[PDB]
Amino acid sequence: DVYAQEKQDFVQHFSQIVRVLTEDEMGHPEIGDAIARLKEVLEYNAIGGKYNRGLTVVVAFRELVEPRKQDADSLQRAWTVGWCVELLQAFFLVADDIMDSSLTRRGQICWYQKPGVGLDAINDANLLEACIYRLLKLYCREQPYYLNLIELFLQSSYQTEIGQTLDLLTAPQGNVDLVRFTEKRYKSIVKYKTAFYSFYLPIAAAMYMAGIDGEKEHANAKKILLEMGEFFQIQDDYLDLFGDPSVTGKIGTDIQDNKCSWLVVQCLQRATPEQYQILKENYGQKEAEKVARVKALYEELDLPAVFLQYEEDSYSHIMALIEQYAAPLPPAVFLGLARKIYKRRK
């Protein structure tokens, strides 16, 4: 609703993002070809998703500043920082697609699987990360929140990299240990790898933009948002296997790449001993034969019904946390973001 009306405005602002990033080194014409490559990197990897995270920055911002303080410049900043969050996303996704050996993202081939790119994508990603800070300096250099935003984006990146490290250490290629795949470990992975940057970051960004910068307001926002981000990742794990790749826009890899997916942890909690072994023999391997066997087992234990149950209970809990911890923020802030991830299928 609030997200859906703002989408178009938000996407239209991308042209200016590109312009500003591609122009103020063109009285450096010697780098001209690099800057053309940047343009192309941005167009391929910032565009095509739902924009929930960047929209969250613009929406929350609208809802937390008095309209008499929403001058045009201030809006311009709000959706720039919006776009900075989308660039962080793009950054991590381009890298994650290489490290997960994935094939599609957003219903096209992964950047690194393009003829002519491959592992050059690595530097492409680092550039996307640099652009965040280019924009902040351009649009927010003279705001009193400038340094708060810089430190927030850096800390959210560190946290997601710590989470990525955990994600990959728990999933060595060619090493089935199923013993690694616990609830403690899962909860911990998803907190760091998804929950800070996809839920805390954008809302916290708009908080500092509206001058709301006390530790306790942030901590309380955080309690809500880390839990929403956990749920979001479990959805992601479910959709990796049971989703339509024409709706998700991406082909699943989690069983192949030996991942601590939510599904495998649930599986392990339910599995008879004979089931344990079918999973042991078939998991973390690239053979389609063997992946299909894992899925059939998951289906055998009604884990799609267990997902649909978990979704229901988690949503109630998130809502309790909003009742508890939203004040003095408008609940609409959290509710609107919850409604936009409830029962999502991309």
Ligand X SMILES: CC(C)C1=CC2=CC(=O)[C@H]3C(C)(C)CCC[C@]3(C)C2=C(O)C1=O
Ligand Y SMILES: O=P(O)(O)C(O)(Cn1ccnc1)P(=O)(O)O
Contacts with Mg ion, residue ranges (CB under 5 A): 96, 100, 236, 240
Amino acid residing at 270: R
CA distance 117 to 58: 33
Q: Which stretches of the chain are DSSP H helices?
A: 2-12, 14-23, 32-45, 52-64, 72-99, 121-140, 146-169, 183-190, 201-209, 215-242, 245-248, 262-270, 273-282, 288-300, 303-325, 331-341
Nearer to its own copies, 14 or 153 (CB): 153
Write the DSSP symbol of residue 210.
T
Interface with ligand Y, residue 92, by CB under 6 A: yes
Q: Give the interface segment with ligand Y, choosing from 92-100, 128-136, 148-156, 288-296 (CB under 6 A).
A: 92-100
Annotated binding site for dimethylallyl diphosphate: 105, 193-194, 233, 250, 259
Interface with ligand Y, residue 236, by CB under 6 A: yes
Residue 50 interacting partner from ligand Y, ligand X, its own copies, none (CB closer than 5 to 8 Å by kind): ligand X
Report the nearest approach of ligand X to the CB of residue 66 (Å).
Answer: 27
The alpha carbon torsion through 319, 320, 324, 327 (nearest 10 deg) reads 10
Q: Which of 96, 124, 227, 230 binds ligand Y (CB under 6 A)?
A: 96
Nearer to ligand Y, 193 or 218 (CB): 193
Q: Which residues are catalytic?
A: 50, 91, 96, 100, 105, 167, 193, 232, 236-237
Residue 95: how many other CB atoms lie within 10 Å: 21
CA distance 81 to 171: 34
Q: Give the interface segment with its own copies, choosing from 159-167, 209-217, 218-226, 275-283 (CB under 8 A).
A: 159-167
The answer to whether the CB of 123 falls within 8 A of the CB of 117 is no
Q: Give the interface segment with ligand X, choosing from 43-51, 64-72, 169-177, 183-191 (CB under 6 A).
A: 43-51
Report the nearest approach of ligand Y to the CB of residue 164 (Å).
Answer: 6
∠ at Cα 10 (7, 15), nearest 5°?
A: 130
DSSP characters for 285-338? ---HHHHHHHHHHHHHTTHHHHHHHHHHHHHHHHHHHHHHH-TTS-HHHHHHHH
Nearer to Mg ion, 96 or 124 (CB): 96
Cβ contacts of 238 within 8 Å, gap of 6 or more: 262, 263, 304, 307
Interface with its own copies, residue 142, by CB under 8 A: no
Q: Which of 194, 266, 282, 285 binds ligand Y (CB under 6 A)?
A: 194
Report the nearest approach of its own copies to the CB of residue 71 (Å).
Answer: 25
Annotated binding site for isopentenyl diphosphate: 50, 53, 89, 106
Please provide residue 201's backbone torsions phi and psi, each rounded to the nearest 5 degrees.
-50, -55
The answer to whether the CB of 256 falls within 8 A of the CB of 285 is yes
Binding site for ligand X (CB under 6 A): 49-53, 86, 89, 105-106, 198, 236, 248-250, 346
Binding site for its own copies (CB under 8 A): 25, 30-31, 33-35, 37-38, 95, 98-99, 116, 119-120, 122-127, 129-130, 133-134, 137, 147, 150-151, 154, 157-158, 161-166, 168-169, 172, 184, 188, 191-192
